[PDB]
Design a protein around this nucleic acid. Structure first.
Ligand SMILES: [Zn+2]
Ligand SMILES: [Zn+2]
Ligand SMILES: [Zn+2]
Ligand SMILES: [Zn+2]
Length: 1473
RNA sequence: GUGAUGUCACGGAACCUUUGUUGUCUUCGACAUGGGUAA
RNA sequence: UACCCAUGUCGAAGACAACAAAG
């Protein structure tokens, strides 16, 4: 006789579920199992499989109901209905049977004895306990009994740590499964109640069910009545096929960044010319096309679906890369004033190192655990007493724990669901100034401005909230709620807003019953009614305590460009650039606004370095200290791995919205003087200049106790003063003038910290002498042959501190132009044009200036020559090659079926193919033409010519014989000649012998006559014996070498041979096998057959080759193997053939190697080869072809002169001063600013604006040719030296349209430049910042700058044609004696120069000849002295002046034997004239 | 799928430390092609 | 198997090297 009451539990928060465990561990000795006794449980349908279902025990529900009953009986003085309850019986004989025992105190409401063990009737409380089944609680299950694969199908495990209060660092953690109430809100069950129980027991059960507010860690209401995989495979296959796997990770991070929107697919960058040949997105179908067809797929039209697709694809690519009781309700919103980071790692998401916590539907989550932890920390801070409570046991009774036992906080989420942003973070090596090994990672960051609903309920005996809670909530109201991790980088600062508080008296019977009836107004509907009763504001704490953190505002003025780089954003950005500045997102509504900001991590690192460089502990600078378990200044101010820091830097944002500009850079090879291979690049920094300085303003929070301390204030003041003196540039690429701090100023410190922030020798006369003759013509560039000794002895000083005896400061110099100067703005190529590229001068904010990178390059090139050093930029991997001449050792051969052997054909013959004397093309198969199948062709090696008259009147070896005349036709005689006493009889046709045929004109058929026969070399083969000469043909089997009609001459202007062509010029045929000879270059003798044609693309073609080859007499016994060196040389030859700008525009006239893009040597190939012993030296595909050098170009140079590899071989003085990849340089080159209004070379069109200038056209600036200075493969030829262009006044001649060498004209072209030049007399002032420079280093830098009276520099564009001669005068030197004191060093300059020259004497005692050579290359022409300098022309027939061209110079003056000495002796003429 | 006269698990901040940075003159002249002739 | 040269056009580089998380 029982009745069933059905119950339902609805969860308002994600609830906690336990990990499944077998019955062997379900005991009292397992910590993990007993920890989850208050959580939901997971069942197994079978023990082996994880397929199961979540359930809630009836025991947990019963315990919660009993606790609520205790509370209700306490609030009603033990009275339920008209009966009084007993104090309750909680006393068990067998303590062991109880899995757990109560460790909280039991509420007490009466002094009576508990009910008797055996009694006729029991109080309602005892009936509810179960002493009077009577009331049985059944397990609650999901409705419908659904099955799930496993716990991870319904929930995700999360880590919850425990943080020490004093240190701020965690020391332990535990995990639990969180199941979202959105997916699984309701659990249903039943309670079986016996009919004999009293009505008061049922009333108490109902009241306790309605009073139970939490269960399984969540607030609850109890009521009783393929494509991504395929895309990844395709992308990986495309990368594998094209050998572009090194771009995989960059493609994994970029594609992942596409998860924000599919619109980014159309916004992907293109090539530099606007075409779809981007080096990343057009690798292939292409990757861009794959992403395009994935974007508009019907499946991925939803934003969430596209985000999931992008995340899965990025992950796949990354893996490929490897009594009195009151309740106060406070409702408001927590708003993020900074980015925040609640850490939670997904094990299946390995692409991001640091991740934020999200809901299953990708909403940002403000967890309840973090809010409780922050509340406890803030209360402990308020009380100034840490809670020394250990886990487990009876509850702690401190002031904090008492407050926390009445506190309930709702877990919160946000409507905003955009994916988090990814930030790059690194750690710098203090000694090298570069990044440390392995210190590169990325962090997920949630945007600022996200709003979370916030509800806090406090249940306690006080009238309202305690004073501690009031003060903590007022701290949070002032925006000092630091909730999340990564606080030192200014993350996780919230402000509580729209706060309302209301107290409900649960002691009142009416209020208690109202609370019970409405379930405490904790559900979504109940909160709506409750919030109407809430009153705005917060209680004012009587004993209010000030917040522990104080805000200090920083304002930085930088008169220079700035960049905080982000390469992935650039890889995705619409405008193709190598790197772009960092941009963050802030949340507005459901949208994200991107803004440019200086990362808080970078500013924190710079400030920390500034503090550490000037301070040292116990004789050791703070940087060198291990910073483990120490009390040093750096750990006190900034924290360490042991404890949290007392300072927190926020992101500094730039005022206004400065849009970034694009600066191009190219590395200049020190040998060739031109662009180094692959070293062309872009940068997109924020533009800054003295005209419009960047203003970077932000805040950082410092703890009050530090701001009170005098020593910390003094340390921060000295560091910020050194930053204020420009000692610490912000951002990257400061070596080229970026991010120079003009001024720093802090506010809000009450002046505690800011109180600390507050004749040059004449150029020496030169000794250099250069004699110039007006007749002589000199070369544009010469080479300084360097001294063999490059000093690697010194070790580079670290950037960790300033050193005694070393000089730090700034050099202000005046750079003067002595000739026109050209520095182009290459972002736009149409400044002087309405194609022919035309560049404006370099201007920043419409101010003419020289970027620091060009000045740095020029000064570094001079410095590498003053002190002998390595060639810092040099393409060592280049392989030189030359063309053969018509002058033997190459022999025919066929590559065997193995592929590692080539046999040797004994003989070759010329088989006419493209003339009208045979039908070989018709009577040969494709396989025979290709050389696959052997063919039988008659060959003749000697033809016979005869004279009727005995040799006279003009052979040297003739055999006389009897000619029997057969016939005469076509004007040519025909007779069978029998000679060698009848041994050899052959039929031959004969041309009329001049002055001889007339004597014997009489034609007798069957005659006998006297003749003399000679043999001539006629090495030709035909498949069928020709009818004219059916004698002396030997049938031989061999292979046909057919490379096509390759020997061709293509001219824009009509050549002599094609001009005399009679008829109409035919079209170029598509099939190269149909090409037939149409004319003869020597028509008189019917030789040199030629095929002439004309086309629009290539103008006139003249193909003079009519014979293919026939390889016969193969030597199968003889073979030669192919070394890998020969194979790589042949591959280089093939790539040079295929990558040929000057190739003929018709592929029919190209060889089979070039017209069919032969990428490798394969089996069956017929080639020429030269060999040594049993291995092949060189292989060529045609008769006259390319010769490839065996060694790299860098081998032609001494190893001491090669670029330093770091990993410290050591460092040269110039590499030491300017830095390498592993060592940061100690010099920073700022932008030179033009002092006055510019005197220009050419005034522009409009006289209204005088600052702008007019166009001028340079001649063709062509690629430097290393093969000229290096005449060939001989080891005698070396790298002559470092190229330095001489000073000359060809700019005057080329100011008109006069070519430098010729002067005929300079017409526009699609391959030349137009520029505006700063005429001579322009004055710039610039500053070079240096740190830790020796005396001789400063002296030699000054010498490199000033040079001597009579010298100059060359800077900018078109140095060969007289442009860019500039001079530098050192104006002033400021030296950093101390952080507070600076003194001038103009009196110390002579000592600097003397010590530098003494160091030069030490290094090179009397071998300073290079200096003089450099000096002669730096010598500037005196008055009444104008040398003439120009490159030669191709040939003398192209030069009106009559000077010898390159073809006439390679033999003669600049012959291979003496070209190097001519080019290594400065100012050496190449034309006497 | 929990036992039952005793479960503070709202008893526990995934927390602390790290500079997207180092190096690079928007520069610049001789090369490309393969045969033809031996009346 | 031994000589002989003939033709006059043409852009190149477009990022590279390193770190890809540790304590
Ligand atoms: Zn009782
Ligand atoms: Zn406590
Ligand atoms: Zn320390
Ligand atoms: Zn070096």
């Amino acid at each position: 006789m029982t009745t069933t009451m059905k119950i339902s539990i609805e969860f308002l928060e994600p609830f906690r579920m336990t990990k499944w465990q077998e019955s062997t561990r379900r005991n009292k000795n397992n910590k993990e199992f007993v920890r989850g006794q208050a959580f939901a449980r997971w069942h197994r349908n079978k023990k082996d499989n994880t397929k199961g279902r979540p359930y809630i025990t009836g025991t947990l529900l019963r315990s919660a109901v009993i606790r609520s009953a205790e509370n209700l009986l306490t609030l009603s003085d033990g009275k339920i209905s008209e009966k009084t309850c007993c104090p309750g019986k909680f006393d068990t004989e067998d303590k062991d049977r109880l899995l757990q025992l109560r460790q909280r105190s039991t509420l007490r409401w009466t002094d009576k004895n508990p009910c008797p063990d055996n009694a006729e009737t029991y109080c309602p409380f005892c009936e509810l306990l179960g002493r009077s089944f009577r009331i049985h609680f059944g397990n609650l299950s999901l409705p419908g009994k659904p099955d799930f694969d496993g716990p991870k199908a319904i929930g995700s495990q999360r880590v919850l740590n425990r943080v020490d209060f004093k240190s701020g660092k965690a020391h332990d953690f535990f995990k639990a499964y969180e199941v979202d109430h959105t997916r699984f809100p309701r659990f249903e069950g039943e309670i079986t109640i016996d009919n004999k129980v009293s009505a008061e027991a049922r009333k108490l059960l109902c009241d306790s069910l309605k009073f139970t507010d939490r269960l399984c860690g969540a607030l609850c209401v109890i009521r009783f009545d393929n494509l991504a995989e395929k895309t990844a495979e395709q992308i990986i296959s495309i990368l594998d096929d094209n050998k572009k796997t090194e771009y995989t990770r960059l493609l994994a991070d970029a594609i992942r960044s596409l998860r924000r929107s599919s619109k980014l697919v159309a916004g992907l960058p293109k090539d530099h010319d606007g075409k779809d040949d981007h080096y990343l997105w057009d690798i292939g179908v292409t990757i861009r096309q794959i992403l395009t067809t994935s974007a508009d797929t019907k499946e991925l039209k939803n934003a969430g679906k596209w985000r999931e697709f992008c995340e899965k694809l990025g992950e796949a690519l990354y893996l490929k890369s490897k009594s009195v009781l009151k309740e106060t309700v406070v409702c408001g919103e927590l708003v993020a004033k900074t980015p925040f980071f609640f850490g939670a790692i997904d094990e299946d998401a390995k692409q991001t190192a640091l991740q934020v916590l999200l809901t299953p539907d990708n909403k940002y989550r403000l967890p309840r655990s973090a809010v409780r932890g922050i509340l406890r920390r803030d209360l402990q801070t308020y009380f100034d007493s840490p809670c020394n409570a250990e886990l487990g046991g009876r509850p702690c009774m401190c002031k904090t724990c008492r407050i926390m036992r009445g506190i309930t906080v709702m877990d919160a989420r946000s409507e905003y669901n955009a994916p988090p942003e990814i930030r790059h973070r690194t750690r710098i090596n203090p000694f090298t100034g570069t990044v440390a090994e392995g210190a590169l990672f990325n962090m997920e960051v949630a945007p600022e401005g996200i709003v979370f609903p916030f509800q806090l309920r406090y249940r306690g005996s006080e009238d309202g909230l305690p004073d501690a809670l009031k003060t903590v909530l007022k701290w949070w109201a002032e925006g000092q709620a630091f909730m999340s991790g990564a606080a030192s980088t200014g993350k996780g600062r919230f402000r509580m807003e729209n706060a309302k508080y209301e107290t409900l008296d649960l002691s009142d019977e009416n209020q208690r019953n109202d609370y019970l009836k409405n379930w405490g107004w904790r559900d979504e509907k109940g909160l709506e009614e409750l919030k109407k009763r809430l009153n705005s504001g917060l209680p004012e704490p009587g004993n209010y305590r000030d917040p522990k953190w104080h805000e200090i505002n920083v304002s930085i003025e930088m008169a220079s460009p700035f960049i905080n780089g982000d390469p992935i954003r650039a890889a995705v950005d619409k405008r193709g650039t190598a790197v772009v500045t960092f941009v963050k997102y802030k949340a507005e509504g459901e949208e994200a606004k991107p803004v440019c900001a200086y990362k808080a991590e970078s500013f924190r690192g710079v400030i920390r370095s500034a503090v550490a460089r000037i301070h040292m502990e116990d004789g050791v600078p703070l940087t060198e200290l291990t910073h483990s378990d120490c009390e040093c200044l750096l750990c006190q101010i900034f924290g360490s791995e042991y404890e949290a820091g007392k300072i927190r830097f926020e992101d500094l944002v730039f005022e206004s919205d400065p849009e970034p500009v694009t600066f191009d850079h190219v590395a200049i090879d020190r040998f060739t003087g031109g662009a180094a291979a692959k070293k062309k690049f872009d940068d997109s920094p924020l533009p800054g200049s003295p005209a419009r300085p960047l203003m970077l303003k932000g805040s950082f929070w410092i703890r009050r106790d530090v701001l009170e301390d005098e020593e910390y204030c003094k340390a921060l003041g000295k560091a910020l003063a050194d930053v204020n003196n420009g000692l610490y540039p912000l951002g990257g690429k400061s070596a080229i003038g970026y991010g120079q701090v003009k001024s720093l100023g802090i506010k809000g410190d009450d002046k505690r910290i800011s109180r600390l922030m507050n004749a040059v020798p004449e150029k020496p006369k030169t000794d250099a002498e250069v004699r110039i003759e007006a007749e002589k013509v000199y070369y544009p560039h010469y080479f300084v042959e360097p001294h063999k000794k490059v000093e690697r002895e010194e070790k580079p000083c670290g950037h960790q501190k300033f050193h005694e005896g070393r000089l730090t400061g700034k050099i202000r110099c005046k750079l003067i132009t002595k000739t026109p100067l050209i520095v182009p703005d290459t972002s736009n190529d149409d400044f002087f044009r309405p194609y022919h590229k035309s560049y404006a001068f370099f201007r920043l904010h419409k101010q003419i200036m020289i970027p620091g990178s060009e000045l740095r390059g020029m000064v570094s090139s001079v410095y590498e020559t003053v002190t002998n050093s390595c060639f810092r930029i040099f393409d060592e991997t280049k392989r030189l090659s030359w063309r053969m001449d018509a002058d033997q050792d190459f022999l025919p051969g066929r590559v065997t079926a193995d592929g590692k052997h080539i046999q040797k054909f004994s003989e070759t013959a010329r088989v006419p193919f493209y003339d009208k004397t045979q039908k070989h093309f018709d009577i040969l198969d494709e396989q025979e033409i290709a050389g696959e199948k052997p063919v039988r062709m008659w060959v003749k090696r000697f033809i016979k010519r005869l004279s009727l008259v005995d040799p006279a009147k003009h052979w040297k070896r003739r055999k006389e014989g009897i000619a029997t005349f057969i016939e005469q036709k076509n004007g040519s005689y025909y007779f069978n000649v029998v000679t060698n006493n009848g041994c050899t009889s052959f039929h031959l046709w004969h041309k009329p012998d001049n002055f001889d045929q007339e004597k014997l004109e009489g034609i007798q058929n069957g005659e006998k006559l006297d003749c003399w026969v000679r043999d001539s070399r006629y090495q030709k083969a035909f498949q069928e014996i020709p009818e004219n000469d059916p004698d002396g043909w030997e049938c031989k089997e061999g292979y046909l070498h057919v490379v096509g009609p390759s020997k061709v001459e293509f001219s824009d202007k009509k050549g002599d041979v094609i001009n005399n062509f009679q008829g109409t010029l035919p079209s170029v045929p598509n099939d190269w096998k149909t090409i037939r000879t149409n004319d003869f270059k020597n028509r008189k003798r019917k030789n040199e057959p030629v095929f002439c044609c004309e086309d629009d693309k290539g103008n006139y073609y003249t193909m003079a080759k009519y014979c293919e080859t026939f390889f016969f007499d193969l030597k199968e016994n003889e073979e030669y193997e192919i070394p890998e060196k020969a194979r790589i040389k042949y591959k280089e030859l093939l790539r040079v053939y295929n990558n040929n700008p000057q190739a003929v525009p018709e592929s029919v006239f190209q060889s089979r190697v070039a017209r069919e893009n032969v990428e490798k040597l394969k089996s069956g190939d017929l080639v020429y080869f030269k060999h040594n012993e049993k291995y092949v030296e060189d292989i060529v595909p045609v008769r006259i072809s390319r010769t490839v050098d065996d060694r790299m170009i860098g081998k032609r140079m001494s190893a001491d002169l090669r670029p330093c590899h770091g990993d410290w071989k050591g460092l040269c003085p110039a590499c030491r001063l300017f830095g390498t990849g592993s060592y940061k340089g100690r010099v920073r080159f700022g932008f030179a600013s033009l002092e006055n209004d510019p005197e220009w070379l050419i005034p522009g069109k409009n006289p209204g604006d005088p600052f702008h200038g007019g166009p001028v056209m340079l001649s063709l600036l062509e690629r430097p040719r290393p093969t000229w200075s290096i005449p060939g493969s001989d080891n005698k030829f070396k790298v002559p030296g470092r190229k330095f262009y001489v000073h000359h006044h060809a700019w005057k001649t080329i100011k008109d349209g006069n070519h430098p060498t010729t002067g005929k004209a300079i017409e526009q072209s699609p391959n030349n430049r137009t520029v505006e030049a700063l005429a001579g007399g322009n004055s710039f002032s610039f500053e070079i910042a240096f740190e830790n420079l020796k005396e001789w280093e400063l002296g030699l830098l000054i010498h490199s700058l000033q040079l001597e009276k009579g010298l100059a520099h060359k800077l900018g564009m078109a140095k060969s044609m007289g442009f860019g001669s500039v001079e530098i005068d050192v104006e002033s030197v400021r030296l950093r004696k101390d952080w507070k004191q600076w003194r001038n060093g103009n009196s110390e300059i002579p000592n600097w120069l003397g010590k530098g020259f003494a160091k030069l004497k030490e290094w090179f005692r009397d071998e300073l000849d290079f200096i003089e050579n450099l000096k002669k290359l730096l010598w500037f022409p005196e008055g009444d002295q104008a040398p003439r300098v120009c490159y030669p022309m191709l040939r003398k027939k192209d030069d009106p002046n009559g000077n010898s061209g390159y073809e006439e110079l390679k033999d003669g003056e600049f012959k291979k034997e003496d070209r190097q000495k001519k080019l290594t002796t400065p100012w050496t003429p190449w034309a006497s004239s």
